[PDB]
Amino acid sequence: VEPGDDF
Amino acid sequence: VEPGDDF
Amino acid sequence: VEPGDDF
Amino acid sequence: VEPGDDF
Amino acid sequence: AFNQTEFNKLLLECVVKTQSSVAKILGIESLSPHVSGNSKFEYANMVEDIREKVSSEMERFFP
Amino acid sequence: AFNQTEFNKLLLECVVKTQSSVAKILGIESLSPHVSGNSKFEYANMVEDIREKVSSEMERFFP
Amino acid sequence: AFNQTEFNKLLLECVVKTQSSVAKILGIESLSPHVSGNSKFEYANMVEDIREKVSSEMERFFP
Amino acid sequence: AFNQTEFNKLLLECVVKTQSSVAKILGIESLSPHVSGNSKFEYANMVEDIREKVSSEMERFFP
């Protein structure tokens, strides 16, 4: 998961 | 819509 | 009201 | 408690 | 006793206050110099992403 | 097994905790070199805005 | 005087919108110059921590 | 059919996720160059104030 992805 | 506007 | 005060 | 710890 | 009406009042006040506060934090952060010139962290773009996520979660409970 | 009272405890603890934490973050962000100077992002101004938004959402549900 | 369905609509819209907005704020903050080299605050690491916390709270109320 | 169990699941997931995310944002912000040594925005001090606020609103509903 990358910065700004929803989780 | 601009920074600080409600959305 | 100042920065960090609850509101 | 340190920065980033849950509280 | 546990007053449900008062609970709802506090509950709603918190979540509305937090969403409005977070919108402003998002605004300020979008302008942060270290993420300037990154279309990933442009305010309008993030707002679009957010609204899309809300739509799909809301459509699940509210047809 | 599911306990409605415990659910409400956690739920209330979270939203109160989050609002209080967000208030603080908003405070710090309002002081950020890159906006401290924009009166759109002065703390008192933002709090006024936020409270007005809360009022209009609350009034909808509570006389 | 009270509509539970409308209450739930607003409640859900706020918390979903806040979570999505907060994820983005977390993203921007993890890129902040003053925390780089501190891995405790690398995006992936923080997301893992957060998911762990969520799981343990959810497991408590939902099998 | 609107499902109250699924609603509670999503609702709880969001507020726990948000609290945890916001705690990390608070952490990062407390380390921001532009505040440091203002024991007002020192992490431990802010956490203390937050917890105090939480306690007084919880006590009102949960003894």
CB contact under 8 A, H43 and D2: yes
- Token digits for F11? 């739920």
Residue for token pair 């910065």: A3
H3 three-class SS: coil
Residue type (1 letter), G38: N
Resolution in A: 2.5
Which domains are seen in chain G, by residue range?
A: 1-63 (1.10.287.2320)
Residues of chain D in contact with residue G41, where contact means CB-CB under 8 angstroms, are 4
For residue B6, give the nearest of F40, F41, F53 by CB distance: F53
Which strand (E) or helix (H) includes residue F20?
helix F4-30
Taking only Cα atoms into account, the Rg of chain F, rounded to an integer number of angstroms, comes to: 16
Residues E8, F41 contacting (CB under 8 angstroms): no
- Token digits for F33? 């070199």
F28 three-class SS: helix
Distance CA H55, CA H57 (A): 6
Q: Does B5 touch chain F (CB under 8 A)?
A: no
* Closest C-alpha among G36, G29, F60 to residue H28: G29
> Computed from CA positions of residues F51, F53, B2, G9, in that sequence, does the dihedral angle turn out positive or negative?
positive
End-to-end CA distance of chain D: 8
**CB count in 10 Å sphere of residue H39:** 9
End-to-end CA distance of chain H: 36
- Token digits for H4? 């109250």
Residues A7, G24 contacting (CB under 8 angstroms): no
Distance CA F45, CA F59 (A): 21
Size of the G and H interface in Cβ pairs below 8 Å: 67
Residue G45, CA distances (Å) to A7, F11, H6, H24, H41 in order: 13, 25, 28, 11, 24
The DSSP result for H18-60, as a single string, is: HHHHHHHHHHHHHT-TTTTT-TTT-HHHHHHHHHHHHHHHHHT
- Token digits for H59? 């006590």
- The number of helix segments (H) and strand segments (E) in chain B equals 0, 0
- Method of structure determination: X-ray
CB contact under 8 A, A3 and G30: yes
Task: Work out the minimum CA distance from C3 to partner chain F, whole angstroms.
Answer: 4
Query: F interface toward C at CB cutoff 8 Å?
Result: 20, 23-24, 26-28, 30-31, 43-44, 47, 50-51
Nearest CA in chain A to E41: A4
**CB count in 10 Å sphere of residue E9:** 14
Answer left, alpha or beta for residue F2, where phi above 0 means left and psi between -120 and 50 means alpha. beta
Burial of H63 (0-12, 13-18, 19+ CB in 10 A): exposed
Distance CA H27, CA F55 (A): 30
E42 three-class SS: coil
Encode G28-41: b = buried (16+ Cβ within 10 Å), e = exposed.
Answer: bbbbbebbeeeeeb
Tell me the helix, strand and coil percentages in chain B, rounded to 5: 0, 0, 100
Taking only Cα atoms into account, the Rg of chain E, rounded to an integer number of angstroms, comes to: 16
For residue G20, give the nearest of E32, E54, E61 by CB distance: E54
- Token digits for F54? 């809360």
Residues of chain H in contact with residue F13, where contact means CB-CB under 8 angstroms, are 54, 58
Residue C7 neighbours by CB under 8 Å, 6+ apart: C1, E17, F23, F47, F50, F51
Nearest CA in chain G to D6: G53
The DSSP result for G1-63, as a single string, is: ---HHHHHHHHHHHHHHHHHHHHHHHHHHHT-TTTTT-GGG-HHHHHHHHHHHHHHHHHHH--
**CB count in 10 Å sphere of residue E52:** 12
What would you measure as the largest C-alpha separation in chain D, in angstroms? 10
